[PDB]
């Protein structure tokens, strides 16, 4: 099950999360991937904050979803 | 977290940004106590951790210094506040802004000028402005000097700087007795950038002249010769001002 | 061998494997035993250029260069970073290092199509990040464009995101005409380059020629694009042109004609790009009444003006007289 990560600046990331993963995996896998340290950055989805700590089979996450990335402090 | 977005908005395009983020770094570093030998008060355990931790502040400040000249000046302002609550600081401080006099200081005695017009001021295209007070850091460099000759070195391998910086600024008097306005050039207004450059380079080295006068009034101590050298020199920036006018 | 002893000397504890390099002592406390030694050892110029010898012959190993980029640990009874961005931290060493970083680069961009362990441009261009002081603005800039003209989509992309953190001061000028000249010749990198435009330093005469450029394309670019698009017009925008691009904006709205689950991300995306633009920018802020008030319809002005009288306290009963 891979998902398309849309930063700013139109930059694709491919990454795999399966169904029954949650939020902070993905943020743990995006820092494992981009570096970004997980509580900086910030997730949106159907322009809907990803509520921390809840897994995405609760939001209606399928296959290639894309999810948009804001980072709070610029470059990191 | 607060270190963090402090070192992320140095590279911000804004220039209240720049002096926020920069204003920030020396006030938090004024206020952690560095529990080795700092004087007085007017503490955390972890005293190694404070230590490193105001080093690589004082890197960061090493970045800060090459930018655009409030933020210079703002941090020259600021050094002297954060030396007398910090004192061990002090010890890179100095050697920081004696780079910077070394970014302008020539070594020679035989060379006249102790400032290059050129570097002193930001060159670039379709217009002029200052780029780092030269006469700000000398106020600072006295200003420094002065407060840990008359506390520190009374209250107690590296010493040897603290007399070169005062042969650096006796050299940065004698020359600039014997100095004159050709090698300065002057004798210029908005109307032209030659004039803007040339109104900047009258200012500076009023300043740094008028500092020469603190710093001569201070060591001299009452002696015929230095007091002769502060009337000379008094006069140079007199006629400067006059001519100003 | 000589790198290596003076790297051992130094106190930093290399470890290859999957171990990474303990450090015996601090890293400020490294810098400055490295750097007094280097400069009270005899032969200065020859000793540093061994050291660079070394240095380079060391790291041609695979498993040596990906162990020594990575970021350190901490040997102790503070946070470790790599051993690369010490050696940054020495001022002396800069110009060295950052040439074998870049002659080092083209070798892995074959590595970049296979590798899936770690991108290794993305790590090095994250190293490369928070220097202290550029040594030399010109050969950055040199480095710089040739990554952009011979790497790829994805690492010219990925450099040109890193731009405001790797440059200093002294390269926004000519830099910018650089990436200017780049935006003339090419179109798929171009909204990045609009977001450094944004972040970077430029003056508003410079930035005049690329507003006029990019006027033109909004009416004709993707919802997926816009929200950086309106962030770079916002911020690069003088006083006295504040009533001009906003009339302008507001007519060339692609909202329209545009209007999945992407697609109302990107709004929402959009209307935080207003909100952090409005929120400050306060002439933009005035102008936008202004500008709407001579218009005297569209649902986008609507919102925008919903969310004005939300968030700007001083405006509320200027707006509700306005509504």
Same mark, same amino acid.
């Given at each position: 099950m891979?998902?398309?990560?849309?930063?700013?600046?139109?930059?694709?990331?491919?990454?795999?999360?399966?169904?029954?993963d949650?939020?902070?995996?993905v943020?743990?896998?995006?820092?494992?991937?981009?570096?970004?340290?997980?509580?900086?950055?910030?997730?949106?989805?159907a322009?809907?904050?990803?509520?921390?700590?809840?897994?995405?089979?609760?939001?209606?996450?399928?296959?290639?979803?894309?999810?948009?990335?804001?980072?709070?402090?610029?470059?990191? | 977290?607060?270190?963090?977005?402090?070192?992320?908005?140095?590279?911000?395009?804004?220039?209240?940004?720049?002096?926020?983020?920069?204003?920030?770094?020396?006030?938090?570093?004024?206020?952690?106590?560095?529990?080795?030998?700092?004087?007085?008060?007017?503490?955390?355990?972890?005293?190694?951790?404070?230590?490193?931790?105001?080093?690589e502040?004082?890197?960061?400040?090493?970045?800060?210094?090459?930018?655009?000249?409030?933020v210079?000046?703002?941090?020259?302002?600021?050094?002297?506040?954060?030396?007398?609550?910090?004192?061990?600081?002090?010890?890179?401080?100095?050697?920081?802004?004696?780079?910077?006099?070394?970014?302008?200081?020539?070594?020679?005695?035989?060379?006249?000028?102790?400032?290059?017009?050129?570097?002193?001021?930001?060159?670039?295209?379709?217009?002029?402005?200052?780029?780092?007070?030269?006469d700000?850091?000398?106020?600072?460099?006295?200003?420094?000097?002065?407060?840990?000759?008359?506390?520190?070195?009374?209250?107690?391998?590296?010493?040897?700087?603290?007399?070169?910086?005062?042969?650096?600024?006796?050299?940065?008097?004698?020359?600039?007795?014997?100095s004159?306005?050709?090698?300065?050039?002057?004798?210029?207004?908005?109307?032209?950038?030659?004039?803007?450059?040339?109104?900047?380079?009258?200012?500076?080295?009023?300043?740094?002249?008028?500092?020469?006068?603190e710093?001569?009034?201070?060591?001299?101590?009452?002696?015929?010769?230095?007091?002769?050298?502060?009337?000379?020199?008094?006069?140079?920036?007199?006629?400067?001002?006059?001519?100003?006018? | 061998?000589?790198?290596?002893?003076?790297?051992?000397?130094?106190?930093?504890?290399?470890?290859?494997?999957?171990?990474?390099?303990?450090?015996?002592?601090?890293?400020i406390?490294?810098?400055?035993?490295?750097?007094?030694?280097?400069?009270?050892?005899?032969?200065?110029?020859?000793?540093i250029?061994?050291?660079?010898s070394?240095?380079?012959?060391?790291?041609?190993?695979?498993?040596?260069?990906?162990?020594c980029?990575?970021?350190?640990?901490?040997?102790?009874?503070?946070?470790?970073?790599?051993?690369?961005?010490?050696?940054?931290?020495?001022?002396?060493?800069?110009?060295?290092?950052?040439?074998?970083?870049?002659?080092?680069?083209?070798?892995?961009?074959?590595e970049?199509?296979?590798?899936?362990?770690?991108?290794?441009?993305?790590?090095?261009?994250?190293?490369?990040?928070?220097?202290?002081?550029?040594?030399?603005?010109?050969?950055?800039?040199?480095?710089?464009?040739?990554?952009?003209?011979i790497?790829?989509?994805?690492?010219?992309?990925?450099?040109?995101?890193?731009?405001?953190?790797?440059?200093?001061?002294?390269?926004?000028?000519?830099?910018?005409? =650089?990436?200017?000249?780049?935006? &003339? #010749? $090419? @179109?798929?990198?171009? /909204?990045?380059? !609009?977001?450094? %435009?944004?972040?970077?330093?430029?003056?508003?005469?410079?930035?005049?020629?690329?507003?006029?450029?990019?006027?033109?394309?909004?009416?004709?670019?993707?919802?997926?694009?816009?929200?950086?698009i309106?962030?770079?017009?916002?911020?690069?925008?003088?006083?006295?042109?504040?009533?001009?691009?906003?009339?302008?904006?507001?007519?060339?709205?692609?909202?329209?004609?545009?209007?999945?689950?992407?697609?109302?991300?990107?709004?929402?995306?959009?209307?935080?790009?207003?909100?952090?633009?409005?929120?400050?920018?306060?002439?933009?802020? =005035?102008?936008?009444?202004?500008? &709407? #008030? $001579? @218009?005297?319809?569209? /649902?986008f002005? !609507?919102?925008? %003006?919903?969310?004005?009288?939300?968030?700007?306290?001083?405006?509320?009963?200027?707006?509700?007289?306005?509504?």
């Open positions: 891979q998902i398309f990560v849309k930063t700013l600046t139109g930059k694709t990331i491919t990454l795999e999360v399966e169904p029954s949650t939020i902070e995996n943020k743990a896998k995006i820092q494992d991937k981009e570096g970004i340290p997980p509580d900086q950055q910030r997730l949106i989805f322009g809907k904050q990803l509520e921390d700590g809840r897994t995405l089979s609760d939001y209606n996450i399928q296959k290639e979803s894309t999810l948009h990335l804001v980072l709070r402090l610029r470059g990191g | 977290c607060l270190i963090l977005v402090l070192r992320k908005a140095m590279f911000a395009n804004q220039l209240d940004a720049r002096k926020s983020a920069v204003a920030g770094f020396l006030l938090l570093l004024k206020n952690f106590k560095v529990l080795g030998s700092l004087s007085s008060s007017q503490s955390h355990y972890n005293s190694v951790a404070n230590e490193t931790f105001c080093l502040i004082m890197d960061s400040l090493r970045r800060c210094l090459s930018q655009q000249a409030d210079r000046l703002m941090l020259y302002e600021g050094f002297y506040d954060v030396l007398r609550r910090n004192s061990q600081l002090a010890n890179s401080v100095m050697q920081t802004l004696l780079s910077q006099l070394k970014q302008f200081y020539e070594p020679k005695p035989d060379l006249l000028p102790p400032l290059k017009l050129e570097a002193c001021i930001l060159t670039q295209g379709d217009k002029i402005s200052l780029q780092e007070p030269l700000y850091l000398l106020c600072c460099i006295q200003h420094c000097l002065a407060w840990y000759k008359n506390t520190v070195i009374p209250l107690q391998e590296e010493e040897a700087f603290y007399e070169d910086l005062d042969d650096i600024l006796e050299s940065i008097t004698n020359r600039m007795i014997k004159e306005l050709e090698d300065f050039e002057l004798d210029f207004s908005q109307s032209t950038s030659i004039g803007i450059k040339n109104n900047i380079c009258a200012f500076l080295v009023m300043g740094v002249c008028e500092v020469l006068i710093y001569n009034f201070s060591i001299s101590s009452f002696s015929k010769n230095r007091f002769e050298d502060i009337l000379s020199l008094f006069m140079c920036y007199k006629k400067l001002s006059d001519i100003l006018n | 061998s000589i790198f290596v002893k003076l790297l051992k000397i130094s106190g930093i504890i290399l470890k290859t494997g999957e171990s990474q390099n303990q450090l015996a002592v601090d890293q406390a490294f810098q400055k035993k490295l750097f007094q030694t280097l400069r009270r050892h005899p032969s200065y110029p020859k000793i250029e061994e050291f660079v070394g240095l380079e012959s060391y790291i041609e190993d695979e498993d040596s260069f990906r162990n980029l990575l970021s350190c640990e901490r040997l102790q009874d503070s946070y470790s970073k790599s051993l690369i961005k010490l050696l940054l931290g020495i001022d002396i060493l800069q110009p060295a290092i950052i040439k074998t970083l870049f002659e080092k680069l083209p070798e892995y961009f074959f970049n199509k296979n590798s899936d362990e770690i991108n290794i441009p993305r790590l090095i261009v994250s190293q490369l990040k928070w220097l202290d002081r550029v040594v030399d603005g010109k050969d950055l800039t040199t480095k710089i464009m040739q990554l952009i003209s790497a790829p989509e994805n690492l010219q992309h990925d450099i040109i995101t890193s731009l405001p953190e790797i440059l200093g001061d002294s390269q926004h000028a000519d830099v910018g005409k =650089e990436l200017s000249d780049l935006l &003339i #010749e $090419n @179109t798929s990198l171009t /909204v990045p380059i !609009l977001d450094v %435009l944004s972040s970077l330093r430029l003056d508003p005469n410079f930035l005049l020629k690329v507003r006029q450029l990019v006027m033109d394309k909004l009416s004709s670019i993707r919802l997926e694009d816009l929200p950086v309106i962030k770079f017009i916002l911020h690069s925008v003088t006083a006295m042109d504040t009533l001009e691009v906003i009339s302008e904006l507001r007519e060339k709205l692609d909202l329209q004609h545009c209007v999945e689950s992407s697609g109302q991300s990107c709004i929402i995306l959009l209307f935080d790009v207003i909100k952090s633009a409005i929120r400050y920018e306060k002439t933009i802020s =005035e102008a936008w009444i202004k500008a &709407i #008030e $001579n @218009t005297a319809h569209k /649902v002005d !609507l919102v925008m %003006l919903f969310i004005i009288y939300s968030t700007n306290t001083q405006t509320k009963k200027y707006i509700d007289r306005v509504l």
